[PDB]
Ligand binder design. Structure first.
Ligand SMILES: Nc1ncnc2c1ncn2[C@@H]1O[C@H](CO)[C@@H](O)[C@H]1OP(=O)(O)O
Ligand SMILES: [Cl-]
Length: 174
């Protein structure tokens, strides 16, 4: 049974709450469609439609990953007009995050998944279908936290909402 799958880093609740609070303050309803608080995340690699056999194999390669934890500090925000999103990010992403993503991306490639075709730009999407350009303030203060694991999610749309179901999790620092 095929699924739309992706690996992602998650956000502690305290920070998810600070973000949606910041967003509501600086972005009115007309600015775009706001991502649900529980759906806020940072994608490491989008795998697309994947069979069970390939999910198994990918899940195993991910299990072979051996990488220390690292810290994320969200100091950057912006807007991609072509994609029509407003995103949260980082000016200088930690190497550990880049390592983790490229490795997962290379495992996806060798597994026969369809690649980004674009460089990896780590980001958390806040607003979707934000067509028109709007002024982007800096993020809030001290949105910094420790990354202890990564998660394989399944993407599902149902009942007029997008849902992310966790399938498996992997701790870092082994
Ligand atoms: N072709 C694609 N179809 C669906 N999601 C994709 C995708 N390519 C990348 N993604 C990412 O997969 C995640 C879940 O769908 C999203 O965070 C999305 O990134 P985005 O937030 O920048 O849009
Ligand atoms: Cl959403």
């Amino acid at each position: 049974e095929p699924q739309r799958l992706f690996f992602a880093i998650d956000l502690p609740a305290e920070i998810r709450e600070q973000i949606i609070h910041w967003r509501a303050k600086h972005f009115p309803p007309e600015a775009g469609r706001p991502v649900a608080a529980d759906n806020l995340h940072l994608t490491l690699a989008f795998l697309g439609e994947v069979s069970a056999e390939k999910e198994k194999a990918l899940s195993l390669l991910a299990g072979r990953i051996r990488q220390p934890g690292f810290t994320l500090t969200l100091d950057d925000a912006g807007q991609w007009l072509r994609s029509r999103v407003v995103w949260l990010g980082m000016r200088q992403p930690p190497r550990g995050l880049i390592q983790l993503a490229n490795m997962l991306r290379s495992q996806a490639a060798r597994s026969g998944c369809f690649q980004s075709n674009r460089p990896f730009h780590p980001h958390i999407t806040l607003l979707r279908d934000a067509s028109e350009a709007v002024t982007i303030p800096p993020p809030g203060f001290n949105w910094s936290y420790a990354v202890t694991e990564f998660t394989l999610y399944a993407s599902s749309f149902a009942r007029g909402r997008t849902r992310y179901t966790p399938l498996k999790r992997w701790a870092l620092t082994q």
